[PDB]
Design a binder for this molecule. Structure first.
Ligand SMILES: [K+]
Ligand SMILES: [K+]
Length: 327
DNA sequence: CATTAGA
DNA sequence: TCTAATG
């Protein structure tokens, strides 16, 4: 957590690189397990050699460890850090809709900047054009104070369209968080569960509402169960307009709501932790259900859930307010 | 880890 | 169809 920290940081820097700038999925996967294992190790690694006794720790890596232990640096790391191409990749990647593959290609063509990207909108797809368009706004945090005004509008049209819907704004927002990155709305309907052959409209209806009123301004991607867009709080009585925000709305079989909701509410650790416990408590949890364990090794059969509580009950735990679902 | 765009 | 990008 801190005794092996530099090594873990150097290492991830190393990996992240192979992965993006190069297409070394392997080296990349290598750096990570190592970074991973060196991270658990209970003592201060004093040399490659010592490191080396580890699993995943090759001669290539141990070598890196000495140079880093020896001198507080690493050339390779220094060289990469300097590398204009590699840097360019790292950058274009911040555009929404540009992932490594497009970054490389773009650089290849000589588009290494925001401005480059502009001159060439034509070389970009709708998602990328949008991500381009709101490069700033998308990088900006979402103050809870706004999170509350957005949730508010959302639940209102939801309800307007059909009173039968149930929406929940998940994430750190739901767990308290002073600010968030984007909003995550989990949606559901009774008239939609596991079997009941969809109702694509179910999703459409609402997206259409939100738009109708200018809450939704763009569409990054609209499917029949997952809509990914951009929204904006009505810019008041002037002098202050609001930054464009990313929003994701997703349909869900009413019979799977609470688990999904449970889950997406995190935290990553609270989850993992609760989950680890359901195992002891003779269960299995995951994004959609909760199944009882059968001694033979495994088992099936989804227990029925009507609330975040059912799940709790089941593993015989203390209901934890989202607020304190931190870990 | 599953859903969407796209070519 | 595959492959990329998001979350
Ligand atoms: K080893
Ligand atoms: K990106």
């Amino acid at each position: 957590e801190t005794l092996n920290g530099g090594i873990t940081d150097m290492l991830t820097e190393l990996a992240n690189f192979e992965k993006n700038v190069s297409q070394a999925i392997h080296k990349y996967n290598a750096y990570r397990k190592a970074a991973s294992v060196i991270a658990k190790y209970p003592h201060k690694i004093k040399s490659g050699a010592e490191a080396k006794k580890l699993p995943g720790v090759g001669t290539k890596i141990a070598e890196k460890i000495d140079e880093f232990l020896a001198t507080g640096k690493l050339r390779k790391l220094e060289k990469i850090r300097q590398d204009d191409t590699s840097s360019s990749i790292n950058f274009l990647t911040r555009v929404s809709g540009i992932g490594p593959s497009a970054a490389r290609k773009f650089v290849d063509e000589g588009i290494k900047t925001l401005e480059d990207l502009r001159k060439n909108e034509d070389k970009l797809n709708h998602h990328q054009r949008i991500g381009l368009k709101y490069f700033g706004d998308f990088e900006k945090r979402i103050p809870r104070e706004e999170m509350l005004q957005m949730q508010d509008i959302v639940l209102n049209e939801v309800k307007k369209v059909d009173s039968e819907y149930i929406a929940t704004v998940c994430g750190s927002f739901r767990r308290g968080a002073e600010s968030s990155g984007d909003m995550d709305v989990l949606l559901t309907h009774p008239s939609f569960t596991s079997e009941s052959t969809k109702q694509p409209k179910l999703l459409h209806q609402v997206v259409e509402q939100l738009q109708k009123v200018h809450f939704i301004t763009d569409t990054l991607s609209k499917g029949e169960t997952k809509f990914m867009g951009v929204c904006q709080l009505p810019s008041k009585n002037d002098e202050k307009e609001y930054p464009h925000r990313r929003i994701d709305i997703r349909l869900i079989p009413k019979d799977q709501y609470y688990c999904g909701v449970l889950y997406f509410t995190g935290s990553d650790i609270f989850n993992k932790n609760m989950r680890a416990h359901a195992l002891e408590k003779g269960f299995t949890i995951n994004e959609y259900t909760i199944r009882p364990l059968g001694v033979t090794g495994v088992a099936g059969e989804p227990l029925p859930v009507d609330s975040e509580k059912d799940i709790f009950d089941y593993i015989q735990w203390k209901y934890r307010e989202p607020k304190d679902r931190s870990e």
